[PDB]
């Protein structure tokens, strides 16, 4: 099995993605028919990823700065 | 939306996601309902309403995906907006949002189309008669009334099986009278649904009555929007003159999905961040609901109980909005009875007083008092034990476990699992029974019989059985 | 006579000890109107605080 | 005696402001110097209503989204 890569020093790109990243893959298992399934911690600094993101984004920020985009996200 | 020829290009402003700026001619613009579609790539895309702005220019929005945009970009203006074809096939026919019938299809082939945005208020246009809905609901219906037309609260939830309620409202609707009502999830886990359909196979009803479900899988632009759908489709059995009532999704998931508008409409939220407006749309929901003078639209609902803080402005809303209550309880069931509901912790407005009718509200009123015999007397009893007890507190022990297990019942549509027939209630028939049971008429007769039996008459004949 | 005493002893005190018991609980939901006035108040510090953030 | 329809849907132009609209009425029997009663409440709905309205003033509204406009509107 592969595992990715994820650090501290990741750009917070990949870091937002990453997750998202990570769905891509198992797509050829379950499309290919074959079974999986994975990890899932609370990477949690995801929103002020994506988000402190959206300060620079100068998006507007939802609850805990954060958007809805959570639920989007999830 | 137009009666389409043409209908235009403009260009692609600015876009941020779901944020459409674009421009149409400088002559003239649809309204914000009003909507129009443009082919991109693989198919045409119509966004939400565009709110005021400039240069043909203004604010839009869609449930469909942005990517793959291009800036100078081209929409056909759709006019009469939201025109949608349903037809009385639908009943049992699934269709997406765009009625695109998004199961396996049933091809469902439709000769009505409307626009879900048509309003239905009209000034001493329903009838002033005031009728109740009959449920033959042995304890629902008869331990609290039911009003035609009428919105209703939902309490009760997981693990109540409350697709057995539902059931039983099939069985209900055909049993009970032609008139046939749907409803529609949305913002749900899948598997539920999927299981509901082959629970409809199971079922096997599920003819009567058919919906596209939101499953939370999407986009908000089309969730918010779903309400307009359900409201016309009715609105084609109610405007048949048909009268009916359908379930209803949580709504915070509903109101919340305002806020995420507002955020998106970039416009300051309500406190505790809710739309702005968001009671306006309440106004569009509850104020949708109606029993007509030619039809009756009744209705109940399962909100998002958000930490049952009564301080929810959505709890607001739904104490403000609501017209009925649910309860159910798995403690009760824990009893292991089949109704789960909460037997105390029951109130309709509607059911209440005299006026409603004294002697129901008799037999009734006490049946209060009952209740709250029970609860003080299976309260007390654990502590020591009973042979203190006046007799007719043992009596009362007595009339009381049977009265409970007097209520259970069987169903007509509970035979799949166990072949029971069950039958339609009969509120002559209750009262009667009930109230001589109060007075512990025939006071003899054994308890176990009672439980998940028949009529007063029947399960007297049960006492044969005995 | 002691005795009687004694065992009424028992109970008495046990009597005494559902009632005590009782009370507080209604203590306790006006606590949970005071967490329910705070819930509104971070709801609203925090939300004159996000218009603010929003500023 | 008689009084003024008022419904869910109306606008805060007939919600916001109607309750102020019906007074001058009175001025028929009052300014015929004669006395005469009225029942209002749920003035609340005018308050968060007269609010959304704020929303368009896009004014800073106090506690509970609300303008001092009370005392004048009260």
Redesign the interface.
């Known amino acids: 099995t592969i595992v990715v890569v994820a650090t501290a020093s990741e750009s917070a790109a990949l870091q937002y993605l990453a997750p998202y990243a990570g769905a891509a893959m198992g797509e050829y298992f379950r499309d290919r028919g074959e079974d999986a399934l994975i990890i899932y911690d609370d990477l949690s600094k995801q929103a002020v990823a994506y988000r402190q993101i959206s300060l620079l984004l100068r998006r507007?920020?939802?609850?805990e700065?954060f958007?809805?985009d959570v639920?989007?996200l999830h | 939306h137009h009666h389409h020829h043409g209908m235009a290009t403009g260009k692609i402003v600015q876009v941020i996601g779901a944020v459409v700026d674009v421009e149409f001619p400088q002559d003239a613009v649809p309204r914000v309902y009003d909507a129009l579609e443009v082919q991109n790539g693989n198919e045409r895309l119509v966004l939400e309403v565009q709110q005021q702005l400039g240069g043909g220019i203004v604010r839009t929005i869609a449930m469909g995906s942005s990517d793959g945009l291009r800036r100078g970009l081209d929409v056909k203006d759709l006019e009469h907006p939201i025109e949608v074809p349903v037809g009385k096939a639908t009943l049992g026919r699934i269709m997406n949002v765009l009625g695109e019938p998004v199961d396996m299809k049933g091809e469902i082939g439709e000769e009505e189309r409307w626009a879900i945005h048509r309003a239905a208020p009209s000034y001493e246009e329903l009838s002033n008669s005031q009728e109740l809905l009959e449920t033959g609901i042995k304890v629902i219906d008869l331990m609290a009334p039911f009003a035609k037309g009428g919105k209703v609260g939902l309490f009760g939830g997981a693990g109540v099986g409350k697709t057995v309620n539902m059931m039983e409202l099939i069985r209900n609707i055909a049993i009970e009278h032609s008139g046939y009502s749907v409803f529609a999830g949305v913002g749900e886990r899948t598997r539920e649904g999927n299981d509901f359909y082959h629970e409809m196979t199971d079922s096997n009803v599920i003819d009567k009555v058919s919906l596209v479900y939101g499953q939370m899988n999407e986009p908000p632009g089309n969730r918010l929007r779903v309400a307009l759908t359900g409201l016309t489709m009715a609105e084609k059995f109610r405007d048949e003159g048909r009268d009916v009532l359908l379930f209803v999704d949580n709504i915070y998931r509903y109101t919340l999905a305002g806020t995420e508008v507002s955020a998106l409409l970039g416009r300051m939220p309500s406190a505790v961040g809710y739309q702005p407006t968001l009671a306006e749309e309440m106004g569009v929901l509850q104020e949708r609901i109606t029993s007509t003078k030619t039809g009756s639209i009744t209705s109940v609902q399962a909100v998002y109980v958000p930490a049952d803080d009564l301080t929810d402005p959505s709890p607001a809303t739904t104490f403000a909005h609501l017209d009925a209550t649910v309860v159910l309880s798995r403690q009760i069931a824990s009893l292991g009875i089949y109704p789960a509901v909460d037997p105390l912790d029951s109130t309709s407005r509607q059911l209440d007083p005299l006026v409603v009718g004294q002697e129901h509200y008799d037999t009734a009123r006490g049946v209060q008092s009952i209740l709250q015999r029970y609860q003080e007397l299976k309260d007390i009893i654990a502590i020591l034990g009973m042979d203190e007890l006046s007799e007719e507190d043992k009596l009362v022990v007595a009339r009381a476990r049977k009265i409970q297990r007097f209520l259970s019942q069987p169903f007509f549509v509970a035979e799949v699992f166990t072949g029971s027939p069950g039958k339609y209630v009969s509120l002559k028939d209750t009262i009667r029974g009930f109230k001589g049971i109060m007075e512990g008429e025939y006071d003899h007769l054994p308890e176990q019989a009672f439980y998940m039996v028949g009529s007063i008459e029947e399960a007297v004949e049960k006492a044969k059985k005995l | 006579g002691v005795v009687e005493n004694l065992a009424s002893e028992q109970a008495a005190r046990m009597v005494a000890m559902k009632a005590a018991t009782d009370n507080g609980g209604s203590l306790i939901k006006e606590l949970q109107l005071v967490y329910n006035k705070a819930r509104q108040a971070s709801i609203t510090q925090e939300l004159t605080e996000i218009v603010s953030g929003a500023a």
């Open positions: 507007p920020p939802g609850r700065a958007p809805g639920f989007y």
